[PDB]
């Protein structure tokens, strides 16, 4: 992908003025240096390869941190709701555009540590992860019958092995993902006081993407241990169709509300370089 | 040349002699649905000129300390005759829009205005509770609303207003106003021109949607330079707005709807 070269130009004398225009039409004059000053012949070699969206999104970033324990009887299993709104690093970049379409990739990291080695020592550990589509039953215990996963995909990871990795396709029910929605899920009709038609502004579908569940398989050691899990995400094969200006104030809730940080610009003189 | 244009339909007539060039959003012209991209199966209806005509909205006053105005579509047109009637009987609908703003003044006046068009134009609330705004206040009709110069939280927890509180320099969504020129826009300067025109197609993630629940396009107006005149007492001038849709069709006919209002 080359770039246009610059040709030579000399002096001029006329009333052919391309430097005058009107912005009221909402158009920009495509001016170039050669039309107002003398130039020498030059040949360019620079390119715009590092400006593509695919290279703009070719980075992994953290999304969530999870905690879990292992003990005889404090919580033995946990759940997390899937969403990209919990962090600002990727959210700010994604809010550059209105609609998007891409595949997705996943990766997991595991860590563990003692609380006290006074009671004894424990063997290696094994961790379990399962995926719960919307509408599926929720486990009620660390030893529930629901962990059989006869249809729900699940992954097993061994402590000390390299991280796992997963890929999934586009799974939207519409033709593309939507980052904004100016409307309601319900319409309030007559003959209904408070409880019918009441819905939150900007609400999404009844259930978006479900959640994930985690537990440890090994039986309780005579002493307590602690562990954590981290998640990283990586898009690929991206497309976008509409731009927007970026955020400039601290986020507050999933919506566009704001209640603080309303003075980002400092003072300065008018005639200071 | 481009200083003169003609646009007039349906037994009305107006005078125009100083319009600038026209604008098309992303260079796309409205069209009907193609057979290779439909999703329903029933035969639709096409009112044609029964709904594709110019409608006139309420008038407003521009003052020295005015802040701005904002409207929503297709909410504003729900009460305009056959278009509104069809919008309530059928479950699904689709349409484009056309806009035209009218404003005139003398030579010794000076000032400037900006016009912006925004799809999926969300706004902030006014209370601690997240996303607590109510339906009846976010769909007020033709009158629209106005921006505020500052942010203030409510205290009547027993009877909350559950209303918006946009800020002009934040554009009502926590972003700088100067960067909004990435949207389609036109600028009116009283010394050069007296009107604006725009063309808007249907933009959404789906070929068709429910018109009662989701609003596609929003419109905002912000003064950039304050109005002034040698008159030291006071001065006011009117603003009038016109809208006209094109390429209408609907599906899913049943009994009528009657939304709740307060």
């Amino acid at each position, epitope marked *: 992908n080359n770039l246009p070269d610059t040709q030579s130009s000399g002096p001029a004398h006329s009333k052919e003025t391309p430097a005058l225009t009107a912005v009221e039409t909402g158009a920009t004059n495509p001016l170039v240096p050669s039309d107002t000053v003398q130039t020498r012949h030059v040949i360019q070699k620079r390119t715009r390869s590092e400006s593509t969206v695919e290279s703009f999104f070719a980075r992994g970033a953290c999304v969530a941190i999870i905690e879990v324990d292992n003990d005889a009887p404090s919580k033995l299993f*946990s759940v997390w709701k899937i969403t990209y709104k919990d962090t600002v690093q990727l959210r700010r970049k994604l809010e550059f555009f209105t609609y998007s379409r891409f595949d997705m990739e996943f990766t997991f990291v595991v860590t563990s540590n003692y609380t006290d080695a006074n009671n004894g020592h424990a063997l290696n550990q094994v961790y379990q992860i399962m995926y719960i589509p919307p509408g599926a039953p929720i486990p009620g215990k660390w030893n529930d019958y629901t962990w059989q996963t006869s249809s729900n995909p699940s992954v097993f990871y061994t402590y000390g092995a390299p991280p796992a990795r997963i890929s999934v396709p586009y799974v939207g029910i519409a033709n593309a993902y939507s980052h904004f929605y100016d409307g309601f899920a319900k319409v309030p009709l007559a003959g209904q006081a408070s409880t019918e038609g*009441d*819905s939150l502004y900007g609400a999404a579908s009844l259930n978006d993407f479900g959640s994930l569940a985690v537990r440890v398989v090994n039986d309780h050691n005579p002493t307590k241990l602690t562990s954590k899990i981290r998640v990283y995400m990586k898009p690929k094969h991206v497309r976008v169709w509409c731009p927007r200006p970026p955020r400039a104030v601290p986020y507050y809730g999933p919506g566009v509300d704001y209640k603080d940080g309303l003075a980002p610009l400092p003072g300065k003189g008018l005639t200071t370089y | 040349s481009v200083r003169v244009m003609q646009l007039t339909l349906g037994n009305s007539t107006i005078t125009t002699q100083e319009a600038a060039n026209s604008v098309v959003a992303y260079g796309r012209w409205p069209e009907y649905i193609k057979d290779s991209e439909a999703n329903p199966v029933d035969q639709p209806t096409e009112p044609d000129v029964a709904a594709c005509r110019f409608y006139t909205l309420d008038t407003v006053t521009w003052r020295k300390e005015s802040r701005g105005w904002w409207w929503k579509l297709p909410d504003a047109l729900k009460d305009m005759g056959l278009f509104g009637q069809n919008m309530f009987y059928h479950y699904l609908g689709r349409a484009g829009y056309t806009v035209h703003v009218q404003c005139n003044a003398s030579k010794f006046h000076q000032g400037a205005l900006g016009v912006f068009a925004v799809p999926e134009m969300c706004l902030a609330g006014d209370s601690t509770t997240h996303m607590f705004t109510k339906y009846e206040n976010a769909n007020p009709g033709e009158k629209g609303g106005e921006f505020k110069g500052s942010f203030t939280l409510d205290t009547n927890a027993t009877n909350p207003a559950r209303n918006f509180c946009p800020v002009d320099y934040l554009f009502g969504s926590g972003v700088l106003a100067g960067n909004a020129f990435v949207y389609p826009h036109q600028i009116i300067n009283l010394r050069t021109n007296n009107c604006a025109t725009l063309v808007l197609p249907y933009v959404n993630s789906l070929s068709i949607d429910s018109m009662t629940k989701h609003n596609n396009w929003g419109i905002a107006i912000l003064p950039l330079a304050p109005l002034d005149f040698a008159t030291e007492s006071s001065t006011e001038i009117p603003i009038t707005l016109t809208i006209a849709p094109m390429c209408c069709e609907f599906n899913g006919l049943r009994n009528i709807t009657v939304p709740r209002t307060q």
Partner: antibody, heavy 132, light 110 residues
Framework: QVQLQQSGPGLVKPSETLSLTCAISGDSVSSKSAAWNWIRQSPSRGLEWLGRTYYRSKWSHNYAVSVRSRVTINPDTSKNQFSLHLNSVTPEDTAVYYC??????????????????????WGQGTTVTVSS | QSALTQPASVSGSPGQSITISCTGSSSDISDYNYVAWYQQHPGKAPKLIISDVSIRPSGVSARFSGSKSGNTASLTISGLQVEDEADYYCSSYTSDINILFGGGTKLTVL
């Protein structure tokens, strides 16, 4: 297993200051996976929540909006106790009071952490009376 | 202020099945499954029965169970017995860092 205990004056006069202290047995107040709440019950009004406090690498507080400025809660590391303070006492304050514990639910995140739906351990209930 | 709604009172005979519902505004129940239940007896402090819609702590019989999402949460009981008579209250936790309780349900026998 872990059990609570209630203490403090049972009678109050209008315009005075009321303070109560609850004692923990078998657990540590600085626990990083627990929370402590104050509740009062009255037949005319039923159950209602006042405030809470917890320690996560630092001390923190949470108070109800309606009585935010009238309430103050302070801990006591040495006693393994936490104390309540209420001002502008009035006849309406005559009701039963408990100290309780909260356990963590499992959906995690939001503002980084987990959610504490409710309570599992309850005290005996200490009565406070306003007269004269 | 939005407040939760409960039926005034219900009674039955041993061996039957019982259903109770708690309902309120959207801001209180429609967000997520942040729902819990408590029980009380004459002269007794409240006791937990159910947390998180359907999770039964230790010592809770399989008879008491109920679940739903949206604008209403339902509690269902099977194998009804005399000792099951008690007072019932629904609870919720909102995004505004607040806790709410319903008007309560009154069931008592001398």
């Amino acid at each position: 297993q872990v059990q609570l205990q209630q203490s403090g004056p049972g009678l109050v006069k209008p315009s005075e200051t009321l303070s109560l202290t609850c004692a923990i047995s078998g657990d540590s107040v600085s626990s990083k996976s627990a929370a402590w709440n104050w509740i009062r019950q009255s037949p005319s009004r039923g159950l209602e929540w006042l405030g809470r406090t917890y320690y996560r690498s630092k001390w923190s507080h949470n108070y109800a909006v309606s009585v935010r400025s009238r309430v103050t809660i302070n801990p006591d590391t040495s006693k393994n106790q936490f104390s309540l303070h209420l001002n502008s006492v009035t006849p309406e304050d005559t009701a039963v009071y408990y100290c309780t514990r909260a356990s963590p639910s499992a959906y995690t995140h939001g503002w980084y952490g987990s959610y504490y739906y409710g309570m599992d351990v309850w005290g005996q209930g200490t009565t406070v009376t306003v007269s004269s | 202020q939005s407040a939760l709604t409960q039926p005034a009172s219900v009674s039955g005979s041993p061996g039957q099945s019982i259903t109770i519902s708690c309902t309120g505004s959207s801001s209180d129940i429609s967000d997520y499954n942040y729902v819990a239940w408590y029980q009380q007896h004459p002269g007794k402090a409240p006791k937990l029965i159910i947390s998180d819609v359907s999770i039964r702590p230790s010592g809770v019989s399989a008879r008491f169970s109920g679940s739903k999402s949206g604008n209403t949460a339902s509690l269902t009981i099977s194998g009804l017995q005399v000792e099951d008579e008690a007072d019932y209250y629904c609870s919720s936790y909102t995004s505004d860092i607040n806790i709410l309780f319903g008007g309560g349900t009154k069931l008592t026998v001398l």
